[PDB]
Design a protein around this ligand. Structure first.
Ligand code: BOG
Ligand code: BOG
Ligand code: BOG
Ligand code: BOG
Ligand code: BOG
Ligand code: BOG
Ligand code: BOG
Ligand code: BOG
Ligand code: BOG
Ligand code: BOG
Ligand code: BOG
Ligand code: BOG
Lengths: 306, 306, 306
């Protein structure tokens, strides 16, 4: 009965493993860094999956309440997302086990959204105050992750379907999210979830480049531009985001940061904006590094688990 | 003085005729099916046009009230949409008459939206509760239909202008529609119009493929992906949609369903996702078939016309 | 302490200079027209920059209040936008001075938005009634202008980043703007700002064509289509827009009109929709001409400056 959002941790580490993996053909030593990150992410995922299985068996009413909440349900999508990313890692060692994880995560996230995201359209449960960045997780991030994982398995055209579902879902949600943020101050207890606002453009372009064989084209450049705009905005907002202190919820940023790193490797490979690429890759790794150090610190104080 | 929404019937049948037409170069027997559907759609259109002319002549205040309503006005767009689709059918037999119908429908829908859709921006008439799926008809569907009909006539670049008007209008409306649906439960009397939510992506890709010579490219695949997401959501929602019983308003689904079928023929021709294409084509035909059987049933009970 | 919105005047004239510049390779006499417009725009810009410097030095609390307003802040973005366009003009005579102006305007607009646009997401200051067309200026128009100016300097890939920031920001804002306009009647004192609604698609395609070497492709045609839809809507709305009389605020239309003219030159060069291109170019010049005549008239009556 771990907090569900703690899945952000293996998610970010797994995505960062994949970014480093994609540098191996330029810098062979990147593979060891990728492998270490990937093993740590997989180990943490195993632990957190077992904990969540325990929650389901013995704390089921807590899961039921999170599921039916028009806000909290979204974090459940971190489970299949991380499952797919761990599959993508494991593909380097065992394509069969990888493929199983990728399909479980894909079928699971699609079933999840089909059951819950659509149900919101019945009205009367979701309220204006439910308009939170976390909605990107089931609606957008899960589809991008399926897109890139299916492309890894060779299913590029199926990947494009998931890609399009995520990209259009993103464009369709974000307008109402930013209008809500403008009007209604997001309370401090939820502010770390502003980190999820960094994700869409970077997760999108990373998935796109995964499906299109790494071709850095006009769409990719357009996505990077909006991604950087959002990064600058969130940097400016950071003191406000952490008004009430640093917390583990800041791992919400790691998905976007890791996807910035991953897409940077493709831009670099493609000889597009190489200087920006190096900055992005270094910046994202430093920030995730700080998240790791803050987390080790909290673990040493017994301030990690609830 | 038929209900204006009954134009959904010849619309769906006409769009389905065109889908079958596009299979003739793979399966010659498809032409007869296409021709039968096209004749039935054209006959029903003639009847309903004559009925609406009678409404205009002798029930004009009812038309005036529907026109000025910030909700009901949208269904009027079914008239030029169906007019264009009937033109597209008739092109196989008489390109001159077809071209006349296509221009009448194009000029008519553009004049309609220019007069009424823009007027909404004056404020104070449209209310939050006016945010209904039917708004897609004048704002989106009409433009896509002009795009594809103009391309049939050889005006591809003009078609792209209409295409872009519809595509961007879609992306610009849908965000606020889905947020409204999430917050406000759509009352049962309007719920069959949820079928219109299926239309945008499928109508969009069908129009796109009509203009771009059937090239199944990245944009087409992206559109199909979001289209299928919406289909799955609407399937899950179907029991809720029909909470208060099956009704003729369910023909609102037929535009999206027929456009799923039409786009499937192009995907199949292009050897992209052929299995998905077959499923989509068969599914859409079965559902429209059920709509026809339910309609024959209602006609036999004298429960069709008001 | 001129009204900040008066920067619309050199902006529109500068953008129109650039449109004529782009016709020189088809009609050599266009260069003189371009040069005259460009000199007049630059002269007016110099004057208004000096006036605004005087406002900053001696009326600073008025600037501070406009800056912190969640509505009025946007007009400040006209300053760096016009600065960049004047740089683009001056490039024909002095690339070094041009490049300085272009970077000042680019760094300035990016810093401006990063500081102010993001701050809105803290909530509680911006209200639903703050949802005005002027928000396009910092959020959208400034990024497009950087995109095209950077491309002029040879920085095409950097230009694409700014382009994408503007294009996605546009799509993300417009949904909530049009919903607001539908529900809430914009008061007459702000209605001339409806002219800014014309800008996005035309500014977007003009910037795009500047970066992509004038290739009139599917995206360009799609953008033009939505642009024309918006033009038709605004033409229909014009009597309402000017309900309370003609005023200098109507220069808000000139950015979109000039960008219609500029993009028309590219469509014409590309042999796409040449007839539409000629109409667009002539229409936009006539309307800006009328704005100039109305302005000379007001200056002769001493009804220009506050
Ligand atoms: C990882 C995702 C966890 C899923 C939690 C499921 C919550 C479902 O919950 C329940 O399902 C029943 C039907 O099975 C209904 O009768 C209950 O009323 C409903 O609450
Ligand atoms: C990882 C995806 C598995 C999620 C299974 C959860 C669904 C539990 O069952 C379903 O959930 C619905 C919520 O929409 C409930 O209303 C209903 O009980 C049921 O349809
Ligand atoms: C929501 C934002 C979507 C922007 C879509 C970008 C359009 C893609 O742009 C297309 O990309 C191709 C590859 O570079 C080019 O050859 C085309 O000419 C270009 O228009
Ligand atoms: C995704 C960005 C990560 C790529 C890391 C690049 C670090 C390499 O650094 C680069 O090495 C080149 C040769 O290899 C030298 O020519 C360059 O000057 C240097 O900048
Ligand atoms: C198929 C579309 C039907 C169009 C219905 C038109 C409704 C117009 O209605 C009327 O138009 C008059 C001007 O002509 C105004 O004076 C009326 O007050 C206005 O209601
Ligand atoms: C098929 C398209 C024909 C529609 C003609 C209907 C317009 C009737 O006339 C117009 O309608 C306006 C509504 O915006 C009314 O306000 C005005 O009477 C008029 O401008
Ligand atoms: C709102 C969603 C719009 C997504 C735009 C998809 C961008 C189109 O994508 C472009 O398509 C071409 C044809 O396949 C490719 O060659 C380009 O490389 C690809 O980016
Ligand atoms: C749009 C989808 C409709 C296309 C219908 C396709 C039905 C044909 O069926 C297909 O026929 C092929 C040869 O013709 C066989 O090779 C395939 O195995 C079979 O699936
Ligand atoms: C061209 C743009 C004009 C910028 C106007 C800046 C307004 C800033 O204003 C002020 O800045 C101070 C810090 O410097 C704060 O202490 C003040 O309280 C804040 O109002
Ligand atoms: C042309 C761009 C220069 C603009 C400088 C204005 C910023 C003045 O300073 C800044 O403005 C903030 C507004 O977000 C204020 O809250 C703070 O005083 C400060 O961060
Ligand atoms: C928000 C609207 C975005 C629409 C994106 C348009 C997709 C661009 O379209 C792409 O353009 C290329 C250049 O013409 C073509 O070769 C591709 O086949 C076409 O899909
Ligand atoms: C951007 C649109 C502005 C372009 C102005 C075009 C005016 C030229 O006019 C055109 O000249 C051609 C030869 O030069 C003649 O063949 C054409 O018939 C004529 O229409």
């Amino acid at each position: 009965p771990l907090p569900t959002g703690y899945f952000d941790i293996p998610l970010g580490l797994a995505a960062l493993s994949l970014a480093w993996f994609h540098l191996e053909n330029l810098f062979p030593a990147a593979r060891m860094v990728s492998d270490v990150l990937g093993i740590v992410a997989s180990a943490v995922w195993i632990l957190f999956i077992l904990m969540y299985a325990y929650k389901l068996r013995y704390y089921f009413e807590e899961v039921r309440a999170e599921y039916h909440s028009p806000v909290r349900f979204s974090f459940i999508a971190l489970i299949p997302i991380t499952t797919m990313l761990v599959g993508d890692i494991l593909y380097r060692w065992n394509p069969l086990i990888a493929e199983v994880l990728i399909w479980i995560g894909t079928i699971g996230q699609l079933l999840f959204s089909t059951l819950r995201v659509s149900e919101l359209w019945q009205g009367g449960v979701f309220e204006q105050k439910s308009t939170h960045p976390s909605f990107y997780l089931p609606a957008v991030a899960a589809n991008f992750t399926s897109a890139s994982s299916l492309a890894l398995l060779g299913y590029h055209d199926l990947g494009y379907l998931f890609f399009g579902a995520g990209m259009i879902a993103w464009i369709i949600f974000e307008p109402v999210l930013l209008q809500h943020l403008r009007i209604s101050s997001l309370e401090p207890q939820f502010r770390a979830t502003m980190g999820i606002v960094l994700a869409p453009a970077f997760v999108c372009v990373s998935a796109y480049l995964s499906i299109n064989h790494g071709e850095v084209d006009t769409l990719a450049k357009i996505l990077w531009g909006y991604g950087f705009l959002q990064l600058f905005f969130l940097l400016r907002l950071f003191p406000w985001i952490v008004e009430k202190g640093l917390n583990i919820g800041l791992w919400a940023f790691s998905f976007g940061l890791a996807s910035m790193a991953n897409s940077a490797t493709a831009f670099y490979h493609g000889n597009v904006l190489q200087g920006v690429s190096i900055f992005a890759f270094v910046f994202s790794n430093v920030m995730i590094g700080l998240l790791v150090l803050m987390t080790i610190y909290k673990l040493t104080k017994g301030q990690f688990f609830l």
